[PDB]
Ligand binder design. Structure first.
Ligand SMILES: [Cl-]
Length: 342
């Protein structure tokens, strides 16, 4: 009988031939579906009976569901290359998944500033503060960049944390007043200069020159940069992990508790743990993978990019998302609607 495997992953988060290569090597039929919204994935998981054997949630969402019985523990004896994973990244993911019981770290990155090098330098000068959140969180700078286009993510959790860190508050403040007060105060001063709040349109807009500065996910900004280079359109997109720090986050593979094809799922996970497999993915999607054995195999342009693989001094400035109580979640959501309506 045919062996089958159903995977649900983000768009633009695998190499073009990863699945084909796996099928050639193993004889397993893969059904590979994609989503571009975390809201979509989580709704399906909470409803249950998804039909997926492997899914790719955020590490933070995993914490919220470790008690909901959504996932089943990973049998590490079926993953002999588990030893290839970076122990430091396992520790960070274990903040949401104690003892790394349910999740295999896949890729990770930061939320920083993507920008058009030429347009930012034209408007703010040669010494534009591209190494600082000042570039996009000082109203005086956004007023000058307004005409060339400014985008923020449509993501209250990441944007509020970014603002709180910049203001010198706890990035993960549990104080409702921090969100409704100082954080909202700054966002309302910036708001008239922001063209839109959206978590994917900025990728193509950066690549085509339609916006000049964005809050964005590192690898997606690097994808925009590469798309502009492949189009030979002369647009120069870069990305900055600013000097004040930034949020780091981790996407993981996990196995729904009702998965029908568990043996095949473990074959695919151990396939991903082979160093060349995940290095090849990083080469194509411009995200750092969590496999320490894989790093030397990654192309120089990606591995040596400190906005993809940050060195120790930059990693020390990164913070991670803490899961908040529902009451803070709702304050955050309410305040974000007010910010956007401004
Ligand atoms: Cl995360």
């Amino acid at each position: 009988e045919q062996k089958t495997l159903h995977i649900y992953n983000w768009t633009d988060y695998i190499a073009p031939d990863t699945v084909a290569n796996f099928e050639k090597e193993t004889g397993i039929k893969v059904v590979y579906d994609v989503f571009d919204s975390n809201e979509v994935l989580e709704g399906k998981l909470m409803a249950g009976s998804t039909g997926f054997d492997l899914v790719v949630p955020s590490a933070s969402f995993l914490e919220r569901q470790l008690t909901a019985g959504v996932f089943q523990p990973l049998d590490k004896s079926k993953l002999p290359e588990w030893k290839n994973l970076d122990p430091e990244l396992l520790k960070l993911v274990a903040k949401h998944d104690p003892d790394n019981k349910f999740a295999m770290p896949y890729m990770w990155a930061t939320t920083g500033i993507g920008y058009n090098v030429d347009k930012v330098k034209a408007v703010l000068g040669e010494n534009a503060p591209v190494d600082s959140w000042d570039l996009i969180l000082k109203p005086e700078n956004l007023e000058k960049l307004k005409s060339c286009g400014v985008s923020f993510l449509d993501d209250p959790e990441e944007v509020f944390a970014t603002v709180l860190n910049y203001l010198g508050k706890d990035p993960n403040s549990t104080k409702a007043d921090d969100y409704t007060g100082p954080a909202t105060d700054l966002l309302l001063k910036l708001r008239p200069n922001i063209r839109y709040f959206h978590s994917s349109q900025y990728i193509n807009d950066l690549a085509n020159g339609d916006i000049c500065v964005a809050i964005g996910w590192a690898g997606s900004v690097w994808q925009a940069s590469n798309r502009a280079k492949e189009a030979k359109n002369g647009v120069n997109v870069s990305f900055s992990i600013p000097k004040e720090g930034a949020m780091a986050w981790f996407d993981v593979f996990a196995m729904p508790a009702d998965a029908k094809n568990k043996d095949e799922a473990y074959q695919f996970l151990n396939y991903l743990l082979r160093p060349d497999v995940v290095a090849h993915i990083s080469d194509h999607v411009f995200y750092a993978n969590a496999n320490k054995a894989a790093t030397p195999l990654v192309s120089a342009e990606v591995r040596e990019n400190p906005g993809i693989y940050p060195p120790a001094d930059v990693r020390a400035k990164l913070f991670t998302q803490k899961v908040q109580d529902p009451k803070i979640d709702r304050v955050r959501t309410r305040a974000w609607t007010k910010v956007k309506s401004g």
